[PDB]
From a paper:
HAdV-D10 is a rare serotype isolated from the eyes of patients with conjunctivitis. HAdV are non-enveloped viruses measuring 90–100 nm and arranged in an icosahedral capsid with protruding fiber proteins at the pentameric vertices. Structural and biological studies of HAdV-D10 knob protein highlighted low-affinity engagement with native adenoviral receptors CAR and sialic acid. HAdV-D10 possesses characteristics of a promising virotherapy, combining low seroprevalence, weak receptor interactions, and reduced off-target uptake.
Taking all together, we generated the first reported structure of the HAdV-D10 fiber knob and demonstrated that HAdV-D10K can form weak interactions with several known adenoviral receptors and may use CAR and/or sialic acid for infection. We investigated binding of HAdV-D10K to known adenoviral receptors CAR, CD46, and DSG2 by using surface plasmon resonance. HAdV-D10K was able to bind to all three receptors, but the interaction was weak for CD46 and DSG2 (KD: 20 and 125 μM). We demonstrated that HAdV-D10K forms a stronger interaction with CAR than CD46 and DSG2 (0.44 μM). This is still considered a weak interaction in comparison with CAR binding to HAdV-C5 knob (0.76nM). We conclude that, although the binding is weak, HAdV-D10 can bind and use CAR as an entry receptor. Although several binding sites were identified, we determined that HAdV-D10K forms weak interactions with CD46, insufficient for cell entry.
Author numbering:
A (entry chain B), B (entry chain A), C (entry chain C): 187 to 369
């Protein structure tokens, strides 16, 4: 499978700025032609952990890329660690190894490659999450489909602020969206 | 079925202002009592294609109506073209229009018809999409259930901008919501 | 089952400020590891029915708590009435009470208890609903998971305004979100 996730375990699984500096809590759940997605992010390390824009005003956005082969396995030059990401059983993920989740991938027809044809804005799903769950502390999470090259399919999360933040931990609220499946 | 959609093909399928001037990319996917919906809009023609509010400040909202008989077939005086809209098999629809679509329709109990009784606002699901996928360029998408007359069921999208736009193509981001099913 | 709901009937089922003063229209629908949730609120009685902030500027937020035992039955010191809340069969509920809908519950792993650790903000799902479906009249709906004590699981809705409202009926638009299931 119903579900292809990174375990909810919060053992860091994502490399933004330095090795295993973050936990991306992505959960994809197939309902026929739509994948239902729930996403969250805890930076625990280095750049992007604590934000001081009085210090570093240049720092106010970053990116996490998920790339996939013709089959839909995570290509290990994705920001996300390949081991934790696999179809879920219970509190774990069937262990074994991931293979053949096509149609967990976003539809190429619906969400074309940049090369294949002129892209429209339906490729994108803007959402807003909140740092520390504080209403005064929002940030944007622009999810973008099959727009990376060096892969057959992409999901790519772009995080951005626009507010000058002084000592704010980048741990987000949950956000939910859907996209159209390849099959 | 799982899914009732307009093909993602982007061959114009919707009549807002003039014949086939737009592509409504609606995708309904039944999860028991809830329909999970993903919606997008590309205007390609005439009024509402390029927005100049310096020229036409009066122009900042329009409407797309989906009407359904007792059975849940699109009544062909809906803004959406009746041919492209049918239960999905592959990237097409078996290309013979459906007969038994009910319970893709929004619940009359939950979302009543405009009776004498006190009407509550739970009929409505406000969302925000973004023109050209630009954060500076938002617009509203008020989805409204079973409030149109001359039909048994309605889904109706109301698009509005508070913002004075100078030469902006009305092509939207994806937006996802859910409603309660009739059956 | 697919669905665990409060009937869509407008018969008050929730106690905010005084006995049965409100109708919470909560609808949980299991798609594997994610619950897809649709929520609405009609206050019909007493404090929080009509809002005058010229009169009572102190009044601009309130809370509805859903509590669950190890098994996932609503504990009857929840704001929501235990009788109307049960797995859906037609537009009714088989009128025989459920025990142990676990995995309609939010995951403890994902959404931990306030257990003496660093708590992260992924517990929370901020949304905005609109009073009377009027764009000028928004309110916030901070949904928060497993953060209440005297229970094994919690869903808790926090409603807040920040705008001075003069004679506004607190009846909301629908709002849709998802959380990760326990199992």
């Amino acid at each position: 499978t119903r579900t292809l996730w990174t375990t909810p375990d919060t053992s860091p699984n994502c490399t933004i700025a330095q090795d295993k500096d973050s936990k991306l809590t992505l959960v994809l759940t197939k309902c026929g032609s739509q994948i239902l997605a729930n996403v969250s992010l805890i930076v625990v390390a280095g750049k992007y952990h604590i934000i001081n824009n009085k210090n570093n005003p240049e720092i106010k956005s970053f990116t996490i890329k998920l790339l996939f082969d013709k089959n839909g396995v995570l290509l290990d030059n994705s920001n996300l660690g390949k081991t934790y990401w696999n179809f879920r059983s219970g509190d774990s993920n069937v262990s074994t190894a991931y293979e053949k989740a096509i149609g967990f991938m976003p539809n190429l027809v619906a969400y074309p490659k940049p090369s294949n044809s002129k892209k429209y804005a339906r490729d994108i799903v803007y959402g807003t999450i909140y740092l520390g769950g504080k209403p005064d502390q929002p940030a944007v999470i622009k999810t973008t489909f099959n727009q990376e090259t060096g892969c057959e399919y992409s999901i790519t999360f772009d995080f951005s602020w626009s507010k000058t933040y002084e000592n704010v931990e980048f741990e987000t609220t949950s956000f939910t969206f859907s996209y159209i499946a390849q099959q």
